[PDB]
Design a protein around this motif. Sequence first.
Motif, mmCIF file in Angstrom:
data_model
loop_
_atom_site.group_PDB
_atom_site.id
_atom_site.type_symbol
_atom_site.label_atom_id
_atom_site.label_comp_id
_atom_site.label_asym_id
_atom_site.label_seq_id
_atom_site.Cartn_x
_atom_site.Cartn_y
_atom_site.Cartn_z
ATOM 1 N N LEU A 85 14.807 -2.916 20.256
ATOM 2 C CA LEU A 85 14.880 -2.826 18.788
ATOM 3 C C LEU A 85 16.222 -2.239 18.331
ATOM 4 O O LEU A 85 16.942 -2.880 17.555
ATOM 5 C CB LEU A 85 13.691 -2.053 18.194
ATOM 6 C CG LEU A 85 12.289 -2.687 18.253
ATOM 7 C CD1 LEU A 85 11.258 -1.748 17.640
ATOM 8 C CD2 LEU A 85 12.228 -4.067 17.592
ATOM 9 N N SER A 86 16.561 -1.044 18.829
ATOM 10 C CA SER A 86 17.890 -0.438 18.615
ATOM 11 C C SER A 86 19.036 -1.426 18.841
ATOM 12 O O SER A 86 19.926 -1.535 18.003
ATOM 13 C CB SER A 86 18.091 0.801 19.498
ATOM 14 O OG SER A 86 17.756 1.990 18.805
ATOM 15 N N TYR A 87 18.990 -2.143 19.965
ATOM 16 C CA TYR A 87 19.997 -3.151 20.316
ATOM 17 C C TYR A 87 20.126 -4.246 19.263
ATOM 18 O O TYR A 87 21.241 -4.650 18.908
ATOM 19 C CB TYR A 87 19.693 -3.788 21.681
ATOM 20 C CG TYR A 87 20.475 -5.063 21.950
ATOM 21 C CD1 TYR A 87 21.818 -5.017 22.340
ATOM 22 C CD2 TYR A 87 19.876 -6.317 21.805
ATOM 23 C CE1 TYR A 87 22.540 -6.183 22.583
ATOM 24 C CE2 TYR A 87 20.594 -7.489 22.044
ATOM 25 C CZ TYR A 87 21.922 -7.413 22.433
ATOM 26 O OH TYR A 87 22.627 -8.568 22.673
ATOM 27 N N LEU A 88 18.983 -4.740 18.789
ATOM 28 C CA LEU A 88 18.974 -5.790 17.778
ATOM 29 C C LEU A 88 19.374 -5.246 16.411
ATOM 30 O O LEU A 88 20.169 -5.873 15.706
ATOM 31 C CB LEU A 88 17.616 -6.498 17.718
ATOM 32 C CG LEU A 88 17.314 -7.563 18.782
ATOM 33 C CD1 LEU A 88 15.861 -8.004 18.684
ATOM 34 C CD2 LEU A 88 18.248 -8.770 18.670
ATOM 35 N N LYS A 89 18.843 -4.074 16.058
ATOM 36 C CA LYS A 89 19.145 -3.415 14.777
ATOM 37 C C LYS A 89 20.652 -3.220 14.537
ATOM 38 O O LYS A 89 21.147 -3.428 13.423
ATOM 39 C CB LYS A 89 18.394 -2.079 14.658
ATOM 40 C CG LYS A 89 16.898 -2.216 14.354
ATOM 41 C CD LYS A 89 16.164 -0.882 14.471
ATOM 42 C CE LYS A 89 14.671 -1.045 14.223
ATOM 43 N NZ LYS A 89 13.985 0.263 14.092
ATOM 44 N N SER A 90 21.370 -2.832 15.589
ATOM 45 C CA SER A 90 22.817 -2.660 15.519
ATOM 46 C C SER A 90 23.552 -3.992 15.674
ATOM 47 O O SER A 90 24.370 -4.345 14.827
ATOM 48 C CB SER A 90 23.302 -1.648 16.564
ATOM 49 O OG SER A 90 23.224 -2.174 17.878
ATOM 50 N N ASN A 91 23.244 -4.734 16.740
ATOM 51 C CA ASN A 91 23.969 -5.971 17.071
ATOM 52 C C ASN A 91 23.623 -7.184 16.210
ATOM 53 O O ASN A 91 24.438 -7.631 15.400
ATOM 54 C CB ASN A 91 23.814 -6.315 18.555
ATOM 55 C CG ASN A 91 24.461 -5.290 19.459
ATOM 56 O OD1 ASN A 91 24.351 -4.083 19.234
ATOM 57 N ND2 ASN A 91 25.141 -5.766 20.493
ATOM 58 N N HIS A 92 22.417 -7.711 16.396
ATOM 59 C CA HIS A 92 22.000 -8.941 15.733
ATOM 60 C C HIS A 92 21.129 -8.662 14.510
ATOM 61 O O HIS A 92 20.023 -9.196 14.392
ATOM 62 C CB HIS A 92 21.267 -9.852 16.721
ATOM 63 C CG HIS A 92 22.031 -10.115 17.981
ATOM 64 N ND1 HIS A 92 22.929 -11.154 18.107
ATOM 65 C CD2 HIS A 92 22.033 -9.469 19.172
ATOM 66 C CE1 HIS A 92 23.447 -11.140 19.322
ATOM 67 N NE2 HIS A 92 22.922 -10.128 19.988
ATOM 68 N N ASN A 93 21.641 -7.831 13.601
ATOM 69 C CA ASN A 93 20.944 -7.507 12.350
ATOM 70 C C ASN A 93 20.800 -8.729 11.436
ATOM 71 O O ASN A 93 19.865 -8.816 10.636
ATOM 72 C CB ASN A 93 21.660 -6.369 11.613
ATOM 73 C CG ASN A 93 20.793 -5.725 10.545
ATOM 74 O OD1 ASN A 93 19.861 -4.982 10.847
ATOM 75 N ND2 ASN A 93 21.107 -6.000 9.287
ATOM 76 N N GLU A 94 21.736 -9.667 11.576
ATOM 77 C CA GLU A 94 21.713 -10.946 10.859
ATOM 78 C C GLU A 94 20.443 -11.768 11.107
ATOM 79 O O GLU A 94 19.996 -12.490 10.213
ATOM 80 C CB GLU A 94 22.963 -11.788 11.177
ATOM 81 C CG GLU A 94 23.620 -11.503 12.531
ATOM 82 C CD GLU A 94 24.536 -10.287 12.492
ATOM 83 O OE1 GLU A 94 24.780 -9.691 13.561
ATOM 84 O OE2 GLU A 94 25.007 -9.925 11.392
ATOM 85 N N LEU A 95 19.877 -11.661 12.312
ATOM 86 C CA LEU A 95 18.632 -12.362 12.645
ATOM 87 C C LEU A 95 17.452 -11.639 12.028
ATOM 88 O O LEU A 95 16.598 -12.264 11.399
ATOM 89 C CB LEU A 95 18.405 -12.469 14.158
ATOM 90 C CG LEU A 95 19.484 -12.848 15.173
ATOM 91 C CD1 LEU A 95 18.786 -13.310 16.443
ATOM 92 C CD2 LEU A 95 20.448 -13.923 14.667
#
Lengths: 121, 469, 53, 486, 484
Positions: free
Chosen positions: D447-457
Motif C-alpha cells: 500500500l505504502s509503495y503504491l500510495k507514493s509511486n503509482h498514486n495515479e492508479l
Amino acid sequence: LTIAEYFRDEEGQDVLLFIDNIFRFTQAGSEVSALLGRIPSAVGYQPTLATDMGLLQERITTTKKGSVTSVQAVYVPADDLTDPAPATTFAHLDATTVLSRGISELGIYPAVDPLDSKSRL
Amino acid sequence: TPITGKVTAVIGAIVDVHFEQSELPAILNALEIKTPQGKLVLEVAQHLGENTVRTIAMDGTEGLVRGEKVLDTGGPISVPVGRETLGRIINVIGEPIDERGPIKSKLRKPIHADPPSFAEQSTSAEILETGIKVVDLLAPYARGGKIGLFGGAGVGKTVFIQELINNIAKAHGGFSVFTGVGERTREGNDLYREMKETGVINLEGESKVALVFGQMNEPPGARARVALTGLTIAEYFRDEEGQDVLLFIDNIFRFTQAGSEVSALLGRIPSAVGYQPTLATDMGLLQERITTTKKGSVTSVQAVYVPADDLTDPAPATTFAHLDATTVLSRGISELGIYPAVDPLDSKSRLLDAAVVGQEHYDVASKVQETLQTYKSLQDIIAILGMDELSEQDKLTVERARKIQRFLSQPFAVAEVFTGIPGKLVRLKDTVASFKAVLEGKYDNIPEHAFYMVGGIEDVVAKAEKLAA
Amino acid sequence: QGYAAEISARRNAMDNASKNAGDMINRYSILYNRTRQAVITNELVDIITGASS
Amino acid sequence: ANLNETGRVLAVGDGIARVFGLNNIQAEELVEFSSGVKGMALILEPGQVGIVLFGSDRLVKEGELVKRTGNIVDVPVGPGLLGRVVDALGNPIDGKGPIDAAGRSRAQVKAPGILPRRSVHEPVQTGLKAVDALVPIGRGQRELIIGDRQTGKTAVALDTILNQKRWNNGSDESKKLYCVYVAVGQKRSTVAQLVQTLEQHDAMKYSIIVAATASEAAPLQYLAPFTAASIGEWFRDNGKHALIVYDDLSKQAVAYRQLSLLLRRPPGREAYPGDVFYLHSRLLERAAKLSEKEGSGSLTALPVIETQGGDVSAYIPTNVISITDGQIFLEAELFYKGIRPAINVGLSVSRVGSAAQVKALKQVAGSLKLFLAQYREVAAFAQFGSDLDASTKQTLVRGERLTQLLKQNQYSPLATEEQVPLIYAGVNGHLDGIELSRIGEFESSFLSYLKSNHNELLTEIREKGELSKELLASLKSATESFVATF
Amino acid sequence: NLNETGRVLAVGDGIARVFGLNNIQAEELVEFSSGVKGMALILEPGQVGIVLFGSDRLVKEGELVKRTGNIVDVPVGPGLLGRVVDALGNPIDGKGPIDAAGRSRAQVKAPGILPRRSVHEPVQTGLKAVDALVPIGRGQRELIIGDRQTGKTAVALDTILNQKRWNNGSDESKKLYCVYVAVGQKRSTVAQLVQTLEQHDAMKYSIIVAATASEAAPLQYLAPFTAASIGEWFRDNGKHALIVYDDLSKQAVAYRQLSLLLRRPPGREAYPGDVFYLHSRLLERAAKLSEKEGSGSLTALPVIETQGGDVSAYIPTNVISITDGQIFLEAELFYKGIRPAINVGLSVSRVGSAAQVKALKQVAGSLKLFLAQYREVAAFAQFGSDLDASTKQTLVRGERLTQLLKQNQYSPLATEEQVPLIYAGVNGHLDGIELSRIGEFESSFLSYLKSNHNELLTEIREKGELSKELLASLKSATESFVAT
Ligand SMILES: Nc1ncnc2c1ncn2[C@@H]1O[C@H](COP(=O)(O)OP(=O)(O)NP(=O)(O)O)[C@@H](O)[C@H]1O
Ligand SMILES: Nc1ncnc2c1ncn2[C@@H]1O[C@H](COP(=O)(O)OP(=O)(O)NP(=O)(O)O)[C@@H](O)[C@H]1O
Ligand SMILES: Nc1ncnc2c1ncn2[C@@H]1O[C@H](COP(=O)(O)OP(=O)(O)NP(=O)(O)O)[C@@H](O)[C@H]1O
Ligand SMILES: [Mg+2]
Ligand SMILES: [Mg+2]
Ligand SMILES: [Mg+2]
C-alpha cells in the motif's frame, strides 16, 4: 376379577385368573379420564394411572381364605418397556415373562428374554 | 339502503362488528370501513351470536375505534377477471397496484368458489418437459397437474420457479397467472421487470400473464386470501375461455402460516405444533379448486417453504396429498454445490410409469435410483472409514453414482449471476440416452468434474477435453 | 516386514476413522440436544393445550 | 372521569394492564399512566382495553388513571437525532438535552409496494476485504449477519459503520450513508462501550443509536427495531441513504415470545407465537432501494442472528434467512482458528450483490468466491499424508495465500482502491511465492509503495470505478515490480 | 315450540350452536333452512353442538334448524355396485339414483363373540410376496403401512384387480365384492383410480365411497363408517366383501378437527381422547360370520401413513394393535428395486397358513423364516470376510428369492403360477442362474409350463393341494428346464 374373588373367599380355593390384555385396562381408563376432561399426565395417560392399577392389582392377592394366581398378557406399545403403562405394571408382579422381538425374529419361540424375565422365587 | 353496523372489538387482524338490524352478512362477505386514507376490507369468518360477526381484516387495523361505522358489500371479496388482467399487477382485494389506473373488466368474480366436482374431473398422464435433467429423468411433471417445489430457507425454490417460467411459460402459448404469496416484494418487483424484458408482458401491447401480489409485508388476512384471488383469475380462463392455464404460486406455505397467525384470535384451540385445527380442509378448499376439468386445464407449480428444514411439519406434510409431482430441494445437496438441489430419491412423480414414459425411459431412472440408494446406503461407512474398506463392486457403484450425482446438476439460465456459466436446457430424449450410457459404463475413465454443471452427454466430453490441456 | 507396515496402516487408518467419528459425534450431539428440547417443548405444549378448557 | 379520553385500571400483571373506559382510543394507540410509564392499547374489547406496558409492572396500580395520547405508537424521526442515543420510544439517554425533532412517524408502517422500488446497484462499502469481495452488499439490500455467540458478528457491523466516515465528510448526500444501530437486549455496558468506540472514530456524528437493553421491558425490545426503522426511513423518504443494524434479532424474538406467551397466544414451534416470521418480515421489508420517481432514497438493513451450536436449520435462523437477501455466516471454527472475519464462503451468499459490487472489484475477484469453497473442500481430502499430490497442491498454496490475504484486523476498513490491488495480487497469483508469515507485511508494504509511486492508479480506480485494460496492465506491472522487491 | 326445531345461536368453522331441538337424539341428522345438512354430536342443557356437512356461508344466526328423526344412515345393497358415492351414499359419478335394498346405520355394532367362525378362506392378492409370506384371509384385518409413496394403495389395488378371476364366474361364494374408501384424497386421484379399475374391468364389482380433501371434516370422519355398512350387506347375506380404508390417517385428522372445533378437550398429539375407539370399533366390523348367519365375510385393508417410518407414533401404533397383522412398506427397499417394498421381517399375517391355499403353504414353508436368516447373514457379510460352505450358499440362495419376489405393478398372478415359481426358487433350481436374469426366468418358465406341463397347472388350480405325485412332476419339469 370379581368372579375370581368369590371362589377365593367363599369356596376358599386357589383360583386362576387369566387377563388378556392388561394394557387395555390402562388404555381405556386413559380414554375415560380424557373424556371426563382431566388434564392428561405424561404420554397422555390418566393422572391416576398408578392408583387405578393399584386398585385393580391389589385385589389380585393371596388372602387367608384362598388364593388368586393371575397370569397377564401386557401389550408393550411400540416395543417400549419404559412406556408409563407397562412401567406401572412391573411393580405389581411376582414373576415376569418378557417376550422380545429380537428373539422371535431370529425364529426362537417362545420369544423369551432369559435375562429380562425375572422372578421372586 | 345498504346494511351497516358498528365495530365492537379489535384484536390484531380480528374485527368484531355488531349489526343493529335483522339481517346479518353471510360468512365470507366483504365489509368496508372508510379510513382516513383508503378503505379497509373485512371478511366475515364466523357468526358469534347476539348479532355480532367476527371478521378477518385484509389490511392493518391501527387507528380503528370501537363503535365505528361498517358497510356490508352484500357479497365475498371480488376481483377483476378476463383478459383485462394480463399485463396488470393486482392486489388481494382486486385493486390495481401498478399505478396504471382502473381495470375496466368484463366481470368481477368472488374469490371463494366451490372446487370442481368429482364427475367434473378429467384425467390424463402427459409429461410436461422442462429441459431440466433431474425432473425429466427421475420425477417428471404432469401436464395439467399440480407440482410442488419443497425446500428449506435458501435452497433455491424461487430460482427453480423462475427457470420454469422461463422454460415453459413463454413457449406455452396459453395464459399464465403469477401469485406471490407472503414472499419478498423485491422479488415481485424483479419478476415484473423480467417479464417486461422477455416480452411476456408488453405494457404498450398485449400480454400472456396477469400478476397478483400479497407479499410478506402484508398483514395475515392479506397473506391468507391473496392465493385465492390469483386462483380465481386462473379458473376463469379454464372454464369460460376453455384454456390451459399455468398457475405459479410462491409461496403456498405462506397461506397456511397466515391462517395460523389468525387461528388463535378466531378462538380455535390450537392443533399439533400450534396450527389451526382446520389446516387440512383449508388447504383442500384452495387446492381442490386448482385442477383440470373437462372445460379446460390448469398446470400449477408451487414453491413450498419448509420450517426449520422439517418436512414433517404439518403444513408441507399435508400438501403432499395434493401433488401429482414433487421435487424436493435438500440443503445437504445444495451445500455440496449441486444445483438445483433436487433429492433424486425423495422426489416423486405420478407419471414415472413405464407405460407413460416408455419401458426404456423407466429402466434408466430406476437403476439410477438403485445406484443412488446404494451410495446412500454406504454414506456413513465411507464418511467414517473411507473408500478403502469397501468391496470392489461397491467401490465401483460409488465411483459411478458420484458421477451420476454431479450429472444431475445443471446450469440454469436464470441462475447465470450465481453460476458464472451459460445456462443449458437439455431435452428429455437427450437426458435418458445420456444417463443410459453412463450406466452402461461408457464414461468411467472420464474425470468426475467433467460431469459437473453441464448439458447432455456431449458437453461432458466437450468439457473433459477442456480439462485435458 | 508386511506385518510391521500393516500395524502402521492400522495405526493411521484408525487415526482417521476415530477423528471422523469424533466429528460426527459433535454434529449429532447438536442434533440430539435440539431433539432433546423440542421433545420436552412439544410434550409441554401438548399438556398445556389439554387444559385450554 | 371522562371514559371517552380517560380510563381506569381494572387489573395489571404479566406486563399487561386491563383498562375500563378510553372509549375513543385507537388500536395500537400510545397511553400515559399516572406514574408516567407509557403503554400501548393492543386489544379493543366491549367493556375494557388490553394494554401492553413499556416499563415495569410495579408502576401501575389498579384504580389509576389512563390518559389517551391520540397517537399510534410513534417516534421522533429526522436529522436532529444524528449523534444522539435514545431508548425505544425516542426519549434520550445520553444526557444531551431534548431531541431536535424534525417530526414524528409511526413505529409500524407498511413497506413500500412493488412499484416504488428500484433494483439495487449502488455498493455498500464495508471496508472488509472478505465482505466487499465475496458477499458484497448494496444500498436497499438486506443482508443477514448470522453466526454463533462471540464470532465477530457486531465487528462486521461496526467496521462498516466506521468505514462510512469516508463519504460522510463531504457535500454529496448521494454518496453519504447515515447509520442506525439498534441494541436489542444487549448489556447496557456493552452499548456504552460501543457508543464510546464510535466517538473515538468520529462516527457517532453520522449515526443514531436505538437501545432497549437486557433489563428493559420486552415490549420495549420488540418495539425498538420498528421505531428504529422509522428513524432510518426518514433518510429513505428524503432522497438520502441509510444503514440500519439490528443487534440482534434473536433477542428481539425471545422478547416478543415473552410478550406473546404472557398474552396467552398459543405456543408453536420452540414455543414461539405463530406470527414470529411476520414479526421479522414486516420489519425487514421496510429496507429497500426506492425508485427514480421516489427520490431514489434507500434503507439498507443488516440484521444479526445468533445460532446455537452452529445450527442454521433452527426455526428463527431459517425464518430470517427466508426474509433477507442473503447471509454472511461466521464459523466459530474459523474464528477460533484466528481467521477473522470468519465468513464461511460455502454458507454465505449475497443474492443481489454482483449487481451492486464496485465494478473494479468484481473484475479482479474472478471466481474467488467459487474458488475458496473449492479449496476448502480440497484441503479436506488433504488428510494424507502418504499420498501427497502434485496437481491440486498448487491450489492448496493459493488457498492458504488467499486465506491470509482476506484476514483483517478489526477497525482496519480499507478503501475500495486499497482493496483491488491486494486481490489482484492474490487471484492472479503474484503471491504463491511469498511466505505465509509475511502477507500482512506484504499488505502494508504494498500500500505504502503504491500510495507514493503509482498514486495515479489509486486515484483512477477511486474515480472510474472500473479497470480499463490500460489500467489493468498498469496495475500488473506495478505488481511484478513490487514482487521483485520484498 | 322447540321440540322439533331449533334456531341458530352461533356458527363458525363447520360447527353450529343451535338452541332448542329438545327431542333430538344423539347423532341425529338435521336440515338447515338453507338446505345444508348436519349431525347433532353434542347435547348440553342449553344448546346442541352440530357439525355441518356443508358450507357455513349457508348458515346464519337466527336460522331455523330441523330434526330429521334419523340417526345417520346410508343406502345399502347390491344396487351400489359399479357406482361412486359420497360419505352419505349420494351418487357422485353423475349416473342417477342408487338401488337400495335397504338402509343400514352409520354406526353398527360389530359381531360379538358368538356369531363367528375362524378365518380359513384365502383372499388371494396375486402378489407373490404377500400370498407366500403374509397371506390375507376372509374376515381378516390386514394393515397396509408405510411412508408416503411406498406402494400402499398399489398393494390393495392389485388385490381388487386380481379378484376378477372369480368375480366373472357364476360361483357366488368364491366371489369377492370390493369397496374402496377414499378419505382425504384429492378428487383428481379418485377419478384417476376409478378409471384404472374400469380399464381392468373391475369397477363392475366395486363400490367407491369417497370423502375427498375439500369436504367438511364430518364427511371424512363418517366415510369409513358408512362404507363399512355398505360392505356389511354382503357379509350379512352369505356373500363376501373386501373394504379398503385409504387411508385411516386422514380420517383421524378429520376426527381431531371436529373435536377441537367442538371444543372437546384434546389428548395426546391434540387428538381426541378416544382416537383408538374410532378405529377399534370400525375395524371389529370386519368379521367372518358363523354358519347360522350364512358364513359371509367383511375383510378389511386399512391404510396408515407414517412420517419418516415412525411406527412408534400414536395413530400407527393404535391401528397396529387393532389389526390381525401388517404389511410394512419401505422406501429404502422400494428404491433398491424391491417391489412391493414389503419388509419381510416386520410383516405378519397372524391368521397365517390357515388363510392360504394348501399348494402354496407346502412350497412356501419357512420361506419367511429363511428370508429372515438371509438378512442376518447379509449383515455378517457387511464387514466383508471369507465365505464358507454355509454362508456362500444361503446368500446366493436368498438373493434369488428376494429377486423372485419382485413383481410388476398391475400384474397379479394365479396360485398355479405362484406355486411353481416358489418351488423353483426354494428347492434350489435358481442358484446357478445369473441373479440379473430371474425376470426372464419368470416369464419363460411359465410359457414353458403352459405348453407341456398344463397337466400340473390345472391340477394345482382345481384340487388346491399337492400330492407326492404332483410334486414329483414339479421336481422334474424344473430340472427339465435348467439347461435352457
Ligand atoms: N439453480 C441454482 N443454481 C445455482 N445456484 C442456486 C440455484 N438455486 C439457488 N441457488 C443459490 O442459492 C440461493 C437460493 O435462493 P432462492 O432461489 O431464492 O431459494 P429459496 O429457497 O426461494 N430462498 P427463501 O425463499 O428465502 O427460502 C441463491 O441466492 C443462489 O446463490
Ligand atoms: N477481525 C477481528 N480481529 C480481531 N478480533 C476481533 C475481530 N472481530 C471481532 N474480534 C473480537 O472478537 C470478539 C467477538 O466479536 P464480537 O464483535 O463481539 O461478535 P459477536 O458475535 O457480536 N459476540 P456476542 O455479541 O457476544 O454474541 C470481540 O472481543 C471482538 O472485539
Ligand atoms: N410393484 C411396483 N413396481 C413398480 N412401480 C410401483 C410398484 N408399486 C408401486 N409403484 C409405483 O410407485 C408409486 C407409489 O405407489 P402408491 O400405491 O401410490 O403408494 P402410496 O403409499 O399410496 N403413495 P401415497 O398414497 O401418495 O402416499 C406409484 O406411482 C406406483 O405406480
Ligand atoms: Mg425465495
Ligand atoms: Mg454482538
Ligand atoms: Mg395411495
